[PDB]
Design a binder for this molecule. Structure first.
Ligand code: ZN
Ligand code: ZN
Lengths: 153, 153
């Protein structure tokens, strides 16, 4: 099994640890962990193209998109590889993350290791927002916390 | 061609940005950038196995060593892949890093993307210390700052 980990940090109180595990190279990736300091409700959750945190989360560039698709939700055929949708924060501001995804990988062409995981200000509209920015970012607002996805033991 | 970048941070004053560039896959990786907050003199400079920053630099594991060799200097045949030797801080505590290495890579089995770059408390003895620890770590002392090596534009 391949394993990866991401420590999410930013300028505010938002912080968390996200784990990735992929049992076989042609099988799904399990993604799980916890993020605290968030407002109650939905928050965009994306893999961005670059593992560059030199100017914070901004230098991570756009959503990881090697097939040159439009933005969508994780269940959509039309999506970026990095489109993992929304995480939900409870009343205390904790988002317990538990996702399975078959588009991202921890090896080969859709490998997300060395790229940036980002958690956003507000809801990802999943490409249904009806403006240009819906097709690109999902209108999920500023980047609250980010980290480079690294190889784990 | 392929580029990577690493933001070095720790609990102390050591901070820096290190760039990686490899123009061809069968070819040397240029490593450069500035690290500040160091004590004047030599500091061990290594790629460690895991891109796991959950417990700081400590969770990064040992030197990246896919060929199960003993620790050495960058010029040695007997070395870990991650053995980049020393960097030198000047009298103002700044290490203007400029290294070229043909053993690390930004692709294939010796790929360092998604692993951790670490700068150490003191000099790497390059495996010439005459104790067991010299052939494991180079007696470079504590891990002062670390970062996950991410894919850059
Ligand atoms: Zn997207
Ligand atoms: Zn070593």
């Amino acid at each position: 099994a391949t394993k990866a980990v991401c420590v999410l940090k930013g300028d505010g109180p938002v912080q968390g640890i996200i784990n990735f595990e992929q049992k076989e190279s042609n099988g799904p990736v399990k993604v799980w962990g916890s993020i605290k300091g968030l407002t109650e409700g939905l928050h965009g959750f994306h893999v961005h193209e670059f593992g560059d945190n030199t100017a914070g989360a901004t230098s991570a560039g756009p959503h990881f998109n090697p097939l040159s698709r439009k933005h969508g939700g994780p269940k959509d055929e039309e999506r970026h590889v990095g489109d993992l949708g929304n995480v939900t924060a409870d009343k205390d501001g904790v988002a317990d993350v538990s996702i399975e995804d078959s588009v991202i990988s921890l090896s080969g062409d859709h490998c997300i290791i060395g790229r940036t995981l980002v958690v956003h200000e507000k809801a990802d509209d999943l490409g249904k927002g009806g403006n240009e920015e819906s097709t690109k970012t999902g209108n999920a607002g500023s980047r609250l916390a980010a980290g480079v996805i690294g190889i784990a033991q």
